């Protein structure tokens, strides 16, 4: 155990995080020498983190989740490509000469589980309601990915407007909106927004478009309690494939403990 090399997971609150049984369960089941531990940290002790990390040489890398997902994108040495693009992290890689890079998976967590309910996006249309953090990450990674099209909702007119940017001229070969009478058209419709969580869990869509639904449609939730929605209640009453937050957040663990060097793709 003195021996162990270690990843962290960081942010505020922590207590609630899963990454920790789930590698730790991953670790023991395959003998590995690792482990993952919880940091539940102070904002004001960011920058001191950034340089922690820099010097804690037995450390591999460090899953990044609320609310630092931003704030640690702009402390570390280098971004990917997609990373750079949403100005946000939520996985770094400590290299052996200290440099962290950082990377966000959220979006190929999102298809990965997508591709598992036989959902293949290329030259299809999705609705992605809710333009924040994940919301992006997900728009991002469909667009990469080579959809036909990509409608946005959000009452945020800013936050639309700056994902509308992003995909206009990240993709010029990708039809945007923000206009759209009902759901008939789109292959996915994926809840990004915290509208579905907790006991009194509530809709992000009015009845008259929900109406609208086609059975032949993937429905898709970032939420991660109640595991089904509202959305994904109604989705699977009408014979919609469902994809939950739970499935979204394990097909990542994937991803983040590959760009960590810590687990393979699989
Ligand atoms: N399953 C997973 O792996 C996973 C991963 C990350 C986040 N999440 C969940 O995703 C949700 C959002 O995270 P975030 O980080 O993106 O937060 P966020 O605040 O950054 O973004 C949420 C966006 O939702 C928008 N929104 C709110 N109400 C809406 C509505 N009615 N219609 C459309 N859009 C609306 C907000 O304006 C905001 O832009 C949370 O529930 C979070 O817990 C799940
Ligand atoms: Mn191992
Ligand atoms: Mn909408
Ligand atoms: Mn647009």
């Given at each position: 155990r003195g021996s162990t090399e270690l990843v962290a997971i960081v942010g505020s609150?922590?207590?609630?995080?899963?990454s920790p049984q789930n590698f730790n369960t991953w670790f023991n089941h395959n003998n590995c020498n690792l482990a993952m531990l919880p940091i539940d940290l102070h904002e004001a002790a960011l920058d001191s983190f950034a340089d922690t990390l820099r010097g804690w040489q037995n450390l591999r890398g460090c899953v990044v989740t609320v609310p630092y997902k931003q704030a640690l994108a702009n402390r570390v040495d280098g971004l990917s490509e997609r990373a750079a693009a949403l100005g946000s992290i939520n996985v770094i890689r400590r290299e052996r000469d200290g440099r962290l890079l950082g990377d966000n998976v959220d979006g190929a967590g999102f298809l990965g589980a997508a591709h598992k309910h036989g959902?293949?996006?290329?030259?299809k249309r999705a609705l992605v309601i809710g333009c924040g953090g994940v919301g992006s990450a997900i728009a991002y990674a469909l667009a990469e990915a080579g959809i036909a099209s990509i409608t946005l909702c959000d009452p945020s007119t800013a936050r639309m407007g700056a994902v509308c940017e992003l995909l206009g001229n990240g993709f010029p070969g990708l039809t945007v909106s923000?206009?759209?009478?009902?759901?008939?058209?789109?292959d996915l419709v994926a809840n990004a927004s915290?509208?579905?969580?907790?006991?009194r869990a509530e809709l992000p869509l009015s009845a008259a478009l929900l109406?609208?639904?086609?059975?032949?449609t993937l429905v898709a939730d970032v939420?991660?309690?109640?595991?089904?929605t509202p959305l994904l209640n109604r989705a699977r009453q009408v014979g919609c494939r469902i994809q939950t937050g739970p499935e979204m957040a394990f097909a990542q663990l994937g991803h983040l403990g590959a760009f960590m060097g810590v687990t393979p793709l699989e």
């Open positions: 609150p922590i207590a609630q995080v899963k959902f293949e996006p290329a030259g923000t206009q759209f009478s009902g759901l008939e058209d789109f915290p509208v579905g969580m907790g006991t109406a609208t639904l086609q059975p032949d939420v991660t309690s109640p595991e089904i």
